[PDB]
Write an enzyme that holds these catalytic residues in place. Structure first.
Site, mmCIF file in Angstrom:
data_model
loop_
_atom_site.group_PDB
_atom_site.id
_atom_site.type_symbol
_atom_site.label_atom_id
_atom_site.label_comp_id
_atom_site.label_asym_id
_atom_site.label_seq_id
_atom_site.Cartn_x
_atom_site.Cartn_y
_atom_site.Cartn_z
ATOM 1 N N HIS A 61 0.804 -1.223 0.000
ATOM 2 C CA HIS A 61 0.000 0.000 0.000
ATOM 3 C C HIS A 61 0.839 1.277 0.000
ATOM 4 C CE1 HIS A 61 0.325 -0.206 4.499
ATOM 5 N NE2 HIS A 61 0.105 -1.493 4.285
ATOM 6 N N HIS A 91 6.459 6.702 5.725
ATOM 7 C CA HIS A 91 5.969 6.284 4.414
ATOM 8 C C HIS A 91 5.325 7.481 3.742
ATOM 9 C CE1 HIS A 91 2.565 5.864 7.205
ATOM 10 N NE2 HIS A 91 1.854 6.306 6.182
ATOM 11 N N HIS A 93 2.199 9.024 0.757
ATOM 12 C CA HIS A 93 0.997 8.809 -0.039
ATOM 13 C C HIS A 93 1.144 9.747 -1.210
ATOM 14 C CE1 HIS A 93 -0.957 6.673 3.350
ATOM 15 N NE2 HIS A 93 -0.242 7.521 4.072
ATOM 16 N N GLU A 103 -3.196 13.310 1.689
ATOM 17 C CA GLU A 103 -4.358 12.831 2.410
ATOM 18 C C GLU A 103 -5.019 14.015 3.104
ATOM 19 O OE1 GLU A 103 -3.072 9.159 4.702
ATOM 20 O OE2 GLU A 103 -4.197 8.280 3.024
ATOM 21 N N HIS A 116 4.423 10.662 6.108
ATOM 22 C CA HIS A 116 3.936 10.379 7.447
ATOM 23 C C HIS A 116 5.043 9.739 8.255
ATOM 24 C CE1 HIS A 116 -0.546 10.280 6.058
ATOM 25 N NE2 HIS A 116 -0.123 11.496 6.325
ATOM 26 N N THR A 195 -4.869 6.245 8.762
ATOM 27 C CA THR A 195 -5.603 6.463 7.520
ATOM 28 C C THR A 195 -5.629 5.233 6.626
ATOM 29 O OG1 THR A 195 -3.680 7.199 6.288
ATOM 30 C CG2 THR A 195 -4.909 8.868 7.553
HETATM 31 C C1 LIG Z 1 1.916 0.442 12.471
HETATM 32 C C2 LIG Z 1 1.384 1.625 11.747
HETATM 33 O O1 LIG Z 1 2.075 2.624 11.651
HETATM 34 N N1 LIG Z 1 0.080 1.585 11.158
HETATM 35 C C3 LIG Z 1 -0.442 2.720 10.458
HETATM 36 N N2 LIG Z 1 -1.641 2.816 9.849
HETATM 37 N N3 LIG Z 1 -1.911 4.010 9.273
HETATM 38 C C4 LIG Z 1 -0.932 4.925 9.375
HETATM 39 S S1 LIG Z 1 -0.992 6.549 8.729
HETATM 40 N N4 LIG Z 1 -1.289 6.451 7.124
HETATM 41 O O2 LIG Z 1 -2.113 7.194 9.431
HETATM 42 O O3 LIG Z 1 0.312 7.191 8.992
HETATM 43 S S2 LIG Z 1 0.376 4.233 10.257
HETATM 44 ZN ZN LIG Z 2 0.183 7.417 6.055
#
Ligand SMILES: CC(=O)Nc1nnc(S(N)(=O)=O)s1
Ligand SMILES: [Zn+2]
Length: 257
Positions: A61, A91, A93, A103, A116, A195
């Site tokens: 993802h 990571h 998006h 986002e 993020h 998210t």
């Molecule tokens: C372990 C972990 O980090 N899970 C997450 N799920 N969504 C995230 S986010 N897109 O809000 O940064 S991080």
């Molecule tokens: Zn994220």
């Protein structure tokens, strides 16, 4: 398995994860005129000097760079937070074109991408336990727009060819995440959620006002990645963002006048 496409994307998530329609879901639109300046808020404290990166990974993802979070090394404190939050991973998006990909949005404005940096609260002992608590996570969100190259991102883009498909990973040691930060640490903050599924409502969101700029070549590399595993039909990893969710009974606070 959830995804971002027509038949498994964000409008489908609620079936397996009913919290998708919850009271504190993320991301949200940030309305700059409605967000109130809060002088009780503190300076963010981003201490990444001792950050120890481990691996870079295509998880189907996004791609993530992971960190050693076994002790205080790279932590976030201050701002709206109480106590200490350890960096576990970062990571991005991003979109299929520059006019979408973020986002969070600012006065409905969509950025090319969004970074993020995920941190968990040390008073819960591990990430698994932290995500089950309303103050278990602090996620630092940074917008990317397209323009000049971001030197501190280049080591990441140079390695993306090696993790094209879901499941692939590579050594990614000695990376300094300080190189991904903008100048100003001015931010908005609100209570929210992960998210991506399971969409747990465990996040204090801290979104920086100043975006960083990356070059068209750098973001192009993001777009060459694949959602799918090796050998399957190539389906480009693009538009892996959840759209803005209802704010409901939440206030977004500004750290700046
Ligand atoms: C372990 C972990 O980090 N899970 C997450 N799920 N969504 C995230 S986010 N897109 O809000 O940064 S991080
Ligand atoms: Zn994220």
């Amino acid at each position: 398995h959830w995804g971002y496409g027509k038949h498994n994307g964000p409008e489908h998530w609620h079936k397996d994860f009913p919290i998708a329609k919850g009271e504190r879901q993320s991301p949200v639109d940030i309305d700059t005129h409605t967000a109130k300046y809060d002088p009780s808020l503190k300076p963010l404290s981003v201490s990444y000097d001792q950050a120890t990166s481990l691996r870079i990974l295509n998880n189907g993802h996004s791609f993530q760079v992971t960190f050693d979070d076994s002790q205080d090394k790279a932590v976030l404190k201050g701002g709206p937070l109480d106590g200490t939050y350890r960096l576990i991973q970062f990571h991005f998006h991003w979109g299929s074109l520059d006019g979408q990909g973020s986002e969070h949005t600012v006065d409905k404005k969509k950025y090319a991408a969004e970074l993020h940096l995920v941190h968990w609260n040390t008073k819960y002992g591990d990430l698994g336990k932290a995500v089950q608590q309303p103050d278990g996570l602090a996620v630092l969100g940074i917008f990317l727009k397209v323009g000049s190259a971001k030197p501190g991102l280049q080591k990441v883009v140079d390695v993306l060819d090696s993790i094209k498909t879901e499941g692939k990973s590579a050594d990614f040691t000695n990376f300094d995440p300080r190189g991904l930060l903008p100048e100003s640490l001015d931010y908005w903050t609100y209570p929210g959620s992960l998210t991506t599924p399971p969409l747990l409502e465990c996040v204090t969101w801290i979104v920086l006002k100043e975006p960083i700029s990356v070059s068209s070549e750098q973001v192009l590399k993001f777009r060459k990645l694949n959602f799918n595993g090796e050998g399957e039909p190539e389906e480009l990893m693009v538009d892996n963002w959840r759209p803005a969710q209802p704010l409901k009974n939440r206030q977004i606070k500004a750290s700046f006048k």
